[PDB]
Design a protein around this ligand. Structure first.
Ligand SMILES: Cc1cc2nc3c(=O)[nH]c(=O)nc-3n(C[C@H](O)[C@H](O)[C@H](O)COP(=O)(O)OP(=O)(O)OC[C@H]3O[C@@H](n4cnc5c(N)ncnc54)[C@H](O)[C@@H]3O)c2cc1C
Length: 453
DNA sequence: CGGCTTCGCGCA
DNA sequence: TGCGCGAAGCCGAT
């Protein structure tokens, strides 16, 4: 519907109805940014065709209490910045509190909205909210993929077994869907209290040391749309060249460090891709980084979109389910409870340091996250309980948590999703093994351990 | 049947 | 350090 720099395959109809006479509403959830946002861009273009203004609505659920302050403050601080950015474009933004199923339905009826638009998330709860909203409105309802370069439903119509089968499908579609963004045209027809409330409720559950001092260090990542672009620029200028060689060395700060911003949608992944492609850097680094942000990120969306049990044992490939089941009665060399993992009270100082990097920074290094989750399986009572422990700690403490990438990455580590079978072992069966000595031969483990006590 | 993210391991 | 191989199962291939 309408457009010049607008591929209509990025948009799909969720509900048919008679377009009302009122404003077009972008229900923003996953992509909390004003620039490089196809969902906001398509809402703007729709509003222009109907000769009405575009508005933005955001509903804050009670689901923040299940995580921590660190995610709550990162999102809210960024949202305070976004509120101003939209204001400059004469686009009003309304922030609701409660269940989106009821509030968004009510918001469209009370403000006489003409069209409703939302962005795309493959997670179960978003689909739940959408179905409730559909049953509570009569205006058309659209969905736009503003998070993936190639729309999730276009890249593939099925669960992809591996990156080597998904890669050619995804990259074949890049010349069509990888394109520059148009400017957001302003409207022509023209929070801080929520933040103090949520913190007061989340203070009793704060991660604290033995000195009653909080563990989280908030200065490693400034939230917001402007900071995200700043992190992207310094990556291309200072880190991209060495990425290909040092990306898996957790003693070196060579990752992009973009994942917190990407998760809350404060920066567009397509934007990162556009700028990295144009950079003249190590071709091996660019290929490695573009592979991660394109293939692996968007195959995580694919995984959750086509496996609604994406966070459960049932979603593992049959060979992994058969192997792990056979080893359910094997004696584990160690058994730790969730609380003992959470506090870093295992026998393994490398594991403990990884959990400490997570507790202190809210961003565990990408390489050690594999080691971290595989030892949770190795030292747990059962595969299901390891999945519970890993998902729990990931979503509680990772700034980028509660994300398709986390479920796919944990399912890769514990259940062999998007991996293959390896040598038979006790307890972990044919799931890929990673060892302390394997890490010693790859990077300075003692240095990593010492930085994080 | 070729060859698989991120493996360990032997060996330059 | 980097490379090649081993141990495994299966997908798209033919
Ligand atoms: C056990 C486990 C849990 C994970 N949990 C999360 C999570 O909660 N949130 C999250 O965003 N990522 C998660 N990942 C993926 C990966 O570890 C992080 O995306 C990465 O560490 C973020 O740092 P970065 O942006 O510097 O990564 P970079 O090396 O700079 O990569 C750039 C971007 O590529 C994407 N990417 C990189 N590696 C992967 C991967 N394996 N799968 C999917 N996308 C990837 C991410 O969007 C990332 O931000 C998890 C991986 C594992 C093994």
């Amino acid at each position: 519907p309408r457009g010049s720099h607008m591929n209509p395959k990025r948009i799909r109809a969720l509900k048919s109805g008679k377009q009302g006479d009122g404003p077009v509403v972008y229900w923003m959830s996953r992509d909390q940014r004003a620039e490089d946002n196809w969902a906001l861009l398509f809402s703007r273009a729709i509003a222009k065709e109907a000769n009405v203004p575009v508005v933005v609505v955001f509903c804050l659920t009670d689901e923040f209490l299940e995580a921590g302050i660190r995610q709550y403050e990162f999102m809210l601080k960024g949202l305070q910045e976004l509120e101003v950015s939209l204001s400059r474009k004469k686009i009003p933004s309304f922030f609701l509190r409660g269940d989106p199923g009821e509030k968004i339905s009510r918001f469209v009826k009370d403000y006489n909205a003409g069209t409703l638009v939302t962005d795309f998330s493959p997670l179960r709860i978003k689909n739940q909210w959408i179905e409730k909203v559909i049953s509570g409105i009569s205006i058309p309802f659209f969905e736009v993929d503003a998070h993936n370069v190639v729309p999730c439903w276009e890249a593939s119509q099925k669960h992809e077994y591996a990156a080597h089968t998904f890669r050619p499908k995804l990259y074949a579609l890049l010349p069509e869907f990888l394109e520059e963004f148009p400017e957001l045209e302003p409207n022509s027809v023209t929070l801080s209290d929520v933040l103090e409330t949520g913190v007061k409720a989340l203070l009793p559950e704060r991660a604290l040391l033995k000195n009653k001092d909080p563990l989280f260090e908030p200065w490693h990542f400034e939230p917001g749309e402007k900071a995200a672009k700043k992190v992207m620029e310094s990556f291309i200028a200072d880190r991209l060249d060495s990425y290909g060689a040092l990306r898996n060395d957790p003693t070196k700060n060579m990752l992009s460090n973009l994942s917190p911003y990407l998760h809350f949608g404060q920066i567009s992944s397509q934007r990162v891709v556009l700028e990295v492609e144009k950079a003249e850097s190590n071709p091996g680094s660019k290929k490695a980084f573009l592979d991660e942000i394109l293939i692996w990120k968007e195959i995580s969306d694919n995984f959750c979109y086509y496996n609604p049990g994406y966070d459960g044992f049932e979603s593992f490939p049959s060979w992994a389910k058969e192997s792990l089941n056979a080893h359910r009665n094997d004696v584990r060399s160690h058994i730790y409870t969730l609380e003992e993992f959470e506090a870093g009270k295992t026998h393994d100082p490398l594991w403990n340091a990884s959990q400490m990097e997570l507790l202190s920074t809210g961003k565990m290094h990408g390489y050690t996250r594999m080691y971290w989750a595989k030892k949770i399986l190795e030292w747990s009572e059962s595969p299901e309980k390891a999945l519970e422990i890993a998902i729990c700690l990931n979503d509680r403490y990772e700034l980028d948590g509660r994300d398709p990438n986390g479920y796919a990455g944990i399912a890769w580590s514990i259940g062999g999703v998007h991996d293959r079978a390896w040598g038979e072992r006790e307890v972990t069966g044919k799931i890929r093994y990673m060892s302390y000595e394997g890490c010693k031969r790859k990077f300075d483990v003692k240095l990593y351990i010492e930085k994080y006590s």
